[PDB]
């Protein structure tokens, strides 16, 4: 299995560049490429990705051509350039999975048994990461249900190395927020977290509506994960917790009051100094 | 004819990242690779992609450009959709800055033999360790025109003298045998909204209440140190020595008691406390 | 605020400049070159800045 | 810079004494310098009108040479094209797919300033669609001048579509002022091109939109446009856009020069040098002809800024402000002239600071001390040629030859005793100051 | 001497494993593919040939290569353990041809239909119509057990060339001598 | 004819790259490239897809898509530039073209040159023509003559590298 996938910034700019160049000349939905990376103990670290020619027919959903010789030659070239990178999976810019993704995953497994599909969306979404690493799982499902190839999910996160970090910092030095918890950025982040929570809850509610109406199947799994979530609710308004939280709020407010007093005294001292300076300047004027 | 100092080597976001990565892979040695782009016009050289050439015992020299490797790489990249020409070459100068040596000049002349505008790029992965990216674009100055005309670049505009030459490049031959070209970074959205995800902060981070134990410890420590600093501020203000007070405020400037170690701490405390309290109340409301 | 920012930027700019060597001086030579002895290396006949 | 300064100080004087006396020196400049020299020679005979047609041929009979000859010929008939418009159209049609096209486009645009003739617009459109970098750079300004203040939906459509659809950033630089001038004097009619260009991703198009706000809102100090420009200068990321935003304030406030030094009071001390240069040029364009004596004070410390282009811009703005001024009127004229002399003679000063000092001397001595820079007319109207020339000249940070467009902004400072149609009777009128 | 790219569709279905031919069905098809690849390569030294297995959904074992060595090496381990899908195989082969290295090469597809085509006649006729305008010539080699001169395949070939036909042939081989020799007659010669 | 300072791209057409789709066997692609009465027709339908490849990146200014006046000449022409792979007629219709052209009867004439938006075609390596219909709505369309007018964009042939100065064995 793969416990997590780290997609370095270059993979993303390579996948944005491939989508742009293919889209600019002709029009093609989705963009398929091979992901190259190194294996940690269990955390796959994707660093580079190269394009692979890929024609598909959306209508049939079973016709798709992916170069074998082209992929092998590209991998040989990259091994000559840097051999520490072995094939670890494939990426396609298509926002949603596709019915033929399983065959492509098997073809990739032909080159790497532990293949991770990272769906690198090229549409900027303000709520969430741009990667979603998927893996192929064949099981018996235990709970007496038909088994199929499917796509198990693995946590994805975007890291970077020193060189990529330096490049990113140079690139985003004009649209980057200051590092440090300025109150403006803290309040904005809290608002962003509220918005993200609202979006996640809306997605969960839409899925629950679909399940209730029958449009989608009752999982019998993960659903009780939502039940566990609903059990883990804080249960505020308990008397003991209310007293403790009031104690904490007052303990913080006393420090805030001391800070406000210090700020007021400093401001008053500065005002006194400025007034005396102005008066002295006026007196020395004549 | 003459090259304008207004020429601008456009380096794409992907190209800079790839060049930095390749340079940082080689250190302690020197890596080199061909740069793929377009000579869009006389005053601009646009580089879209850069592909590394395999490390070889020759080093960064005309023989580092394995013809078979380059030919097959270009042929296979054409199929994907990148039918770009070779606009120049890049090589990493570990340790030393962006300049060109004799072998570098020979390789640059060999590249120029194909096209008169084949720009050369030098990147130092060791110097470019922070928000500074020490990347320079260099092209050869016909030593002939050194006397036949005068300098090599027309100055029809001010878009080039807004930069400064470097003692290093000057020592190794800048404005003598090699002349730098302004490096402009071609960045676009989608490629800037994807890179603001290296550290984007999950929604959860903006609703985590920190931990009240170390929060209390930090508040206590900051308050105690602010009490000491208030003692110092008391001593400084109550003194109010008038022996040329304007001079006193300048003879005791050491980033000390008065305000620096002062309300700086007030801001730290109040920001932390306000953020923590607001997060706590937002959680008390949102979660049940 | 602008003065503070400019001071910090100037400090950062000057910090990047290479640190200068320190070496003893043996004697002036021609009113423009001075013989000096850097610490680990040997003697050097170096020029003098304008100031 | 010296060539353009000589052009300025001999503007309209039909006196090329320096050019003829120093012939080896003039020919010592090759490439674009030759283009600038030819343009200067042509402009020196500003308003020469009839004789110019064959005077240019006799003087200037090389691709750069012919292009400069066309550009100078267009400069001679500034805003007064007539048959020169047709001649330049014919010349540009039979162009050599060369910088000669650039010169011909510039000259034709200058000649048909605001005529909005469809044939000239079509020829300029064809040249721009040629997409030849420099050719497009001249074609953008030619299209802007031809449809100046015309508010042509088709013209704006084509120009903005090209700006969004072409590489060759220089063509975008030209199209920026093209779009800005295509909206001169309206100040409300569209108000949508401004938003579209300001929100546009390309920095050059943002500069286009801000030059558009400057030209359209020219004169009337509409606080809405001023606030937009100031906000862009404070916030925008690209530095050239900040320069343009700060510089458009002069065009937007030249009608009320007293308040104008207040807005730039400390906007001239922002940490970014581009905003500093923009503020200096905003002061220069703002107090274009008036020795406000406050703009000079602001420029005085800016003249020693560590940056170069800031010093260049400050010196040029001071020269613009102090044009046509004696020691009695403003007591800093002699000091500023001495500073210009020191900077030009000083060897360790940057070429950029000196390009300014030379331009400043040219501005100071423009027209043998007869022509003045007055964006306003004597009757209060907004002088279109002066504003257009000042805008194109301030757009010399990208193209040196465009500096000649400041020749348009020189309006003679004279009271002519015309009693009859052709009689200039020798009436001797006195003044009340020595 | 005609420059054409051949993408042989070798069948590895389970039916490809009842050896009505002498050694076995798989060996007969292997010899057929060997002969066809050698003939194509010898006819022109710069032509290409690739193979796609028609079992399960499809496979592209050997993308267009100028050397028959890769095709022959991949032909071993064909492992006939699936079922055929003719229309999908032809579509995948057409995509592979579209990805040809040299566009000049003429289209040509050789299909080893060794198992019944459980595809509707309408699908085959539509595919033939699409191939016609696209300009791809498919040579169907009916193999071993089937409805003699299978109606669907014959109609497909007929619609691939109407009122004039060249480079598009259907070959039906009744059980007997190894099919490798038979292919040398009809398709390879013409 | 041709515009000033521009040259026809006939010498710059790589026979290896060019390929026609739906072309009739009797009248092939090669016929339409000759300034003779010989023409190219489409055997299976009015739709045709003609693609041409260029040895080095060329610039596109004007194209002469002449055809017979009988009505079977091109009417609606779609153009794409730098297509990585061959074009399918179903996929060709879906994709947006670089410059969609509605050829008037005047353009089809022997002396008719249809202008192209020069800005879009700056680094064209292979241009594909999609004749979506003919003037007369005939069963098959024909192209009497077809060529592109532009300029050759200098391209670095790194296949012709070679050391021009210095001695072998050097390093750095």
Swiss-Prot record, chain A:
<dbReference type="GO" id="GO:0042803">
    <property type="term" value="F:protein homodimerization activity"/>
</dbReference>
<dbReference type="GO" id="GO:0043161">
    <property type="term" value="P:proteasome-mediated ubiquitin-dependent protein catabolic process"/>
</dbReference>
<dbReference type="GO" id="GO:0070062">
    <property type="term" value="C:extracellular exosome"/>
</dbReference>
<dbReference type="GO" id="GO:0005654">
    <property type="term" value="C:nucleoplasm"/>
</dbReference>
<dbReference type="GO" id="GO:0005634">
    <property type="term" value="C:nucleus"/>
</dbReference>
<dbReference type="InterPro" id="IPR037518">
    <property type="entry name" value="MPN"/>
</dbReference>
<keyword id="KW-0832">Ubl conjugation</keyword>
<dbReference type="GO" id="GO:0016020">
    <property type="term" value="C:membrane"/>
</dbReference>
<dbReference type="InterPro" id="IPR033858">
    <property type="entry name" value="MPN_RPN7_8"/>
</dbReference>
<keyword id="KW-0647">Proteasome</keyword>
<feature type="modified residue" description="N6-acetyllysine">
    <location>
        <position position="200"/>
    </location>
</feature>
<dbReference type="InterPro" id="IPR024969">
    <property type="entry name" value="EIF3F/CSN6-like_C"/>
</dbReference>
From Swiss-Prot, chain C:
<comment type="similarity">
    <text>Belongs to the AAA ATPase family.</text>
</comment>
<comment type="subunit">
    <text>Component of the 19S proteasome regulatory particle complex. The 26S proteasome consists of a 20S core particle (CP) and two 19S regulatory subunits (RP). The regulatory particle is made of a lid composed of 9 subunits, a base containing 6 ATPases including PSMC5 and few additional components. Component of a complex with USP49 and RUVBL1. Interacts with PRPF19. Interacts with TRIM5. Interacts with NDC80. Interacts with PAAF1. Interacts, in vitro, with the thyroid hormone receptor (in a thyroid hormone T3-dependent manner) and with retinoid X receptor (RXR). Interacts with ERCC6.</text>
</comment>
<protein>
    <recommendedName>
        <fullName>26S proteasome regulatory subunit 8</fullName>
    </recommendedName>
</protein>
<comment type="function">
    <text>Component of the 26S proteasome, a multiprotein complex involved in the ATP-dependent degradation of ubiquitinated proteins. This complex plays a key role in the maintenance of protein homeostasis by removing misfolded or damaged proteins, which could impair cellular functions, and by removing proteins whose functions are no longer required. Therefore, the proteasome participates in numerous cellular processes, including cell cycle progression, apoptosis, or DNA damage repair.</text>
</comment>
Swiss-Prot record, chain D:
<feature type="repeat" description="PC 8">
    <location>
        <begin position="278"/>
        <end position="312"/>
    </location>
</feature>
<feature type="repeat" description="PC 9">
    <location>
        <begin position="313"/>
        <end position="353"/>
    </location>
</feature>
<feature type="repeat" description="PC 6">
    <location>
        <begin position="208"/>
        <end position="243"/>
    </location>
</feature>
<feature type="repeat" description="PC 1">
    <location>
        <begin position="36"/>
        <end position="63"/>
    </location>
</feature>
<feature type="modified residue" description="N6-acetyllysine">
    <location>
        <position position="347"/>
    </location>
</feature>
<feature type="repeat" description="PC 7">
    <location>
        <begin position="244"/>
        <end position="276"/>
    </location>
</feature>
<protein>
    <recommendedName>
        <fullName>26S proteasome non-ATPase regulatory subunit 1</fullName>
    </recommendedName>
</protein>
<feature type="repeat" description="PC 2">
    <location>
        <begin position="68"/>
        <end position="101"/>
    </location>
</feature>
<feature type="repeat" description="PC 10">
    <location>
        <begin position="356"/>
        <end position="388"/>
    </location>
</feature>
<feature type="repeat" description="PC 3">
    <location>
        <begin position="103"/>
        <end position="137"/>
    </location>
</feature>
<comment type="function">
    <text>Component of the 26S proteasome, a multiprotein complex involved in the ATP-dependent degradation of ubiquitinated proteins. This complex plays a key role in the maintenance of protein homeostasis by removing misfolded or damaged proteins, which could impair cellular functions, and by removing proteins whose functions are no longer required. Therefore, the proteasome participates in numerous cellular processes, including cell cycle progression, apoptosis, or DNA damage repair.</text>
</comment>
<comment type="subunit">
    <text>Component of the 19S proteasome regulatory particle complex. The 26S proteasome consists of a 20S core particle (CP) and two 19S regulatory subunits (RP). The regulatory particle is made of a lid composed of 9 subunits, a base containing 6 ATPases and few additional components including PSMD1. Interacts with ADRM1. Interacts with ZFAND1.</text>
</comment>
UniProtKB/Swiss-Prot annotation, chain F:
<keyword id="KW-0963">Cytoplasm</keyword>
<dbReference type="GO" id="GO:0005737">
    <property type="term" value="C:cytoplasm"/>
</dbReference>
<dbReference type="GO" id="GO:0000502">
    <property type="term" value="C:proteasome complex"/>
</dbReference>
<keyword id="KW-0813">Transport</keyword>
<keyword id="KW-0676">Redox-active center</keyword>
<keyword id="KW-0249">Electron transport</keyword>
<dbReference type="GO" id="GO:0005829">
    <property type="term" value="C:cytosol"/>
</dbReference>
<keyword id="KW-0647">Proteasome</keyword>
<dbReference type="GO" id="GO:0015035">
    <property type="term" value="F:protein-disulfide reductase activity"/>
</dbReference>
<comment type="function">
    <text>Active thioredoxin with a redox potential of about -250 mV.</text>
</comment>
<dbReference type="GO" id="GO:0015036">
    <property type="term" value="F:disulfide oxidoreductase activity"/>
</dbReference>
<feature type="domain" description="PITH">
    <location>
        <begin position="1"/>
        <end position="168"/>
    </location>
</feature>
């Amino acid at each position: 299995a793969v416990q997590k996938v780290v997609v370095h910034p270059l993979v993303l700019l390579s996948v944005v560049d491939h989508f742009n160049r293919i889209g600019k000349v002709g029009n093609q939905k989705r963009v398929v490429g091979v992901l190259l990376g190194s294996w940690q103990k269990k955390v796959l670290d994707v660093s580079n990705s190269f394009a692979v020619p890929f024609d598909e027919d959306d209508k049939d959903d079973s016709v798709w051509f992916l170069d074998h010789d082209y992929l092998e030659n590209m991998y040989g070239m990259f091994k000559k350039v840097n051999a520490r990178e072995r094939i670890v999976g494939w990426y396609h810019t298509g926002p949603k999975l596709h019915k033929n993704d399983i065959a492509i995953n098997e073809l990739m497994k032909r080159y790497c048994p532990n293949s991770v599909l990272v769906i690198i969306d090229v549409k900027p979404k303000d709520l969430g990461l741009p990667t979603e690493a998927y893996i192929s799982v064949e099981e018996v499902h235990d709970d007496g249900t038909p088994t199929s190839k499917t796509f198990e999910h693995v946590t994805s996160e975007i890291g970077a190395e020193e060189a990529e970090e330096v490049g990113v910092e140079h690139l985003l030095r004009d649209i980057k927020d200051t590092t440090v918890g300025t109150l403006s950025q803290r309040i904005t982040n809290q608002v962003h977290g509220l918005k993200g929570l609202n979006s996640k809850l809306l997605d969960i509610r839409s899925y629950l509506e679909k399940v209730a109406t029958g449009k989608l199947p009752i999982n019998h799994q993960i659903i009780y994960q939502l039940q566990d979530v609903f059990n883990l609710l804080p249960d505020v308004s308990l008397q003991e917790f209310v007293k403790a939280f009031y104690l904490k709020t007052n303990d913080q407010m006393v420090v805030v009051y001391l800070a406000s007093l210090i700020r007021s005294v400093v401001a008053l001292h500065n005002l006194i100094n400025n007034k005396i300076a102005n008066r002295d300047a006026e007196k020395k004027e004549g | 004819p003459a090259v304008d100092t207004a020429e601008q080597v456009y380096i794409s976001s992907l190209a800079l990242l790839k060049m930095l990565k390749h340079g940082r892979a080689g250190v302690p040695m020197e890596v080199m690779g061909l740069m793929l782009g377009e000579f869009v016009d006389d005053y601009t050289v646009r580089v879209i992609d850069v592909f590394a050439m395999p490390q070889s015992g020759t080093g960064v020299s005309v023989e580092a450009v394995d013809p078979v490797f380059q030919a097959k790489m270009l042929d296979m990249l054409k199929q994907t959709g990148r039918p770009e020409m070779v606009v120049g070459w890049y090589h990493s100068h570990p340790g030393f800055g962006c300049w060109l040596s004799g072998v570098d000049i020979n390789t640059q002349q060999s590249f120029e033999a194909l096209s008169e505008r084949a720009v050369a790029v030098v990147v130092d992965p060791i110097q470019s360790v922070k928000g500074k990216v020490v990347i320079d674009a260099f092209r050869l100055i016909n030593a002939n025109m050194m006397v036949l005309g005068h300098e090599p670049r027309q100055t029809t505009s001010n878009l080039g003298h807004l930069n400064k030459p470097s003692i290093q490049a000057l020592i190794h031959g800048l404005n003598r045998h090699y002349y730098s070209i302004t490096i402009n970074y071609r960045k676009n959205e989608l490629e800037q909204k994807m890179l603001l995800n290296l550290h984007k902060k999950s929604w959860m981070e903006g609703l985590t209440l920190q931990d009240y134990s170390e929060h209390c410890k930090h508040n206590e420590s900051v308050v105690k140190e602010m009490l000491e600093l208030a003692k110092n501020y008391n001593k400084a203000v109550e003194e109010e020595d008038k022996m040329t007070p304007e001079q006193l405020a300048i003879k005791n400037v050491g980033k000390q008691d008065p305000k620096r170690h002062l309300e700086e701490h007030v801001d730290v405390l109040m920001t932390s406390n306000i953020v923590q309290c607001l997060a706590a109340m937002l959680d008390t409301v949102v979660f049940k | 605020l602008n003065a503070k920012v400019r001071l910090l930027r100037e400090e950062l700019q000057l910090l990047q400049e290479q640190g200068s060597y320190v070496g003893e001086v043996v004697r002036a030579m021609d009113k423009k070159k001075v013989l000096v002895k850097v610490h680990p290396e040997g003697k050097f006949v170096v020029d003098v800045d304008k100031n | 810079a010296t060539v353009i300064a000589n052009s300025f100080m001999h503007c309209g004087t039909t006196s090329d004494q320096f050019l003829r006396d120093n012939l080896e020196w003039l020919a010592r400049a090759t490439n674009w310098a030759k283009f600038t020299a030819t343009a200067s020679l042509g402009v020196i005979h500003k308003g020469h009108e009839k004789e110019a047609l064959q005077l240019m041929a006799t003087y200037l009979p090389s691709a750069y040479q012919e292009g400069g000859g066309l550009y100078a010929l267009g400069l001679i008939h500034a805003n007064h094209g007539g048959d020169i418009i047709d001649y330049l159209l014919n010349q540009l049609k039979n162009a050599s797919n060369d910088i000669v096209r650039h010169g011909g486009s510039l000259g034709l645009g200058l000649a048909a300033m605001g005529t909005a003739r469809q044939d000239v617009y079509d020829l300029l459109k064809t040249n721009l669609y040629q997409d030849d970098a420099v050719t497009g750079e001249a074609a953008g300004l030619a299209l802007g001048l031809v449809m100046l203040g015309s508010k042509n939906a088709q013209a704006i459509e084509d120009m903005v579509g090209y700006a969004q659809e072409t590489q060759h950033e220089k063509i975008l630089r030209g199209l920026a002022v093209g779009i800005a001038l295509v909206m001169y004097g309206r100040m409300e009619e569209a108000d949508a091109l401004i938003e579209s260009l300001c929100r546009d991703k390309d920095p050059i198009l943002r500069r286009s939109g801000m030059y558009t706000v400057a030209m359209a809102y020219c004169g009337s100090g509409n606080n809405k446009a001023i606030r937009r420009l100031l906000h862009v200068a404070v916030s925008d990321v690209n530095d050239d856009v900040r320069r343009a935003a700060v510089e458009s304030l002069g065009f937007i406030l030249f009608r009320t020069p007293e308040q104008c030094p207040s807005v730039v009071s400390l906007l001239s001390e922002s940490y970014n040098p581009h905003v500093r240069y923009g503020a200096a040029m905003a002061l220069g364009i703002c107090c274009a002809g008036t020795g406000n004596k406050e703009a000079i004070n602001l420029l005085e410390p800016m003249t020693n800024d560590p940056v170069n282009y800031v010093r260049q811009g400050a010196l040029i703005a001071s020269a613009l402000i102090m044009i046509q001024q004696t020691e009695i009127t403003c007591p800093k004229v002699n000091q500023f002239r001495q500073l210009y002399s020191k900077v030009i003679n000083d060897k360790h000063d940057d070429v950029m600071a000196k390009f300014g000092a030379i331009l400043a001397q040219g501005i100071l001595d423009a027209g043998g001390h007869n022509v003045t820079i007055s964006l306003q007319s004597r009757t209060g109207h907004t002088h279109m040629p002066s504003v257009v020339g000042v805008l194109v000249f301030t757009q010399f940070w990208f193209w040196f030859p465009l500096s000649h467009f400041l020749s348009l902004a020189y309006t003679p400072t004279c009271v002519i005793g015309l009693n009859k149609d052709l009689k200039m009777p020798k009436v001797q009128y006195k003044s009340n100051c020595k | 001497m005609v420059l054409e790219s051949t993408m042989v569709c070798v069948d590895n279905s389970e039916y490809m494993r009842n050896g009505d031919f002498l050694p076995t069905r798989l060996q007969a098809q292997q010899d057929a593919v060997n002969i066809v690849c050698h003939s194509k390569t010898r006819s022109n030294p710069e032509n290409n040939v690739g193979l796609i297995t028609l079992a399960n959904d499809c496979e592209v074992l050997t993308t267009l290569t100028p050397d028959t060595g890769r095709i022959l090496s991949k032909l071993h381990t064909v492992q006939p353990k699936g079922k055929i899908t003719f229309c999908t195989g032809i579509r995948v082969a057409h995509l592979a041809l579209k990805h040809r290295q040299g566009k000049n090469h003429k289209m040509r597809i050789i299909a080893f239909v060794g198992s019944p085509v459980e595809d509707n006649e309408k699908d085959l006729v539509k595919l033939a119509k699409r191939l016609k305008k696209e300009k791809v010539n498919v040579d169907i080699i009916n193999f071993g057990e089937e409805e003699v001169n299978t109606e669907k395949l014959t109609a497909f070939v007929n619609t691939l060339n109407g009122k004039d036909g060249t480079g598009s042939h259907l070959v039906t081989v009744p059980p007997g001598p190894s099919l490798a020799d038979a292919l040398i007659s009809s398709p390879i010669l013409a | 004819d041709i515009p000033k300072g521009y040259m026809d791209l006939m010498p710059f057409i790589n026979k290896a790259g060019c390929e026609c789709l739906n072309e009739s066997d009797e009248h092939g692609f090669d016929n339409c490239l000759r300034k003779d009465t010989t023409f190219l027709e489409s055997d299976c339908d009015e739709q045709l897809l003609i693609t041409v490849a260029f040895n080095q990146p060329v610039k596109l200014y004007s194209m002469k898509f002449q055809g017979p006046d009988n009505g079977q000449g091109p009417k609606y022409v779609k153009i794409f530039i730098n297509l990585p792979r061959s074009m399918d007629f179903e996929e060709a219709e879906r994709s947006e073209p670089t410059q969609a052209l509605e050829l008037t009867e005047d353009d089809i004439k022997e002396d008719g040159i249809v202008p192209l938006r020069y800005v879009k075609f700056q680094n064209v390596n292979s241009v594909t023509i999609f004749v979506q219909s003919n003037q007369g709505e005939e069963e098959t369309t024909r192209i009497s003559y077809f060529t592109f007018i532009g300029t050759p964009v200098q391209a670095t042939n790194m296949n012709d590298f070679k050391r021009v100065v210095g001695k072998k064995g050097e390093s750095h």
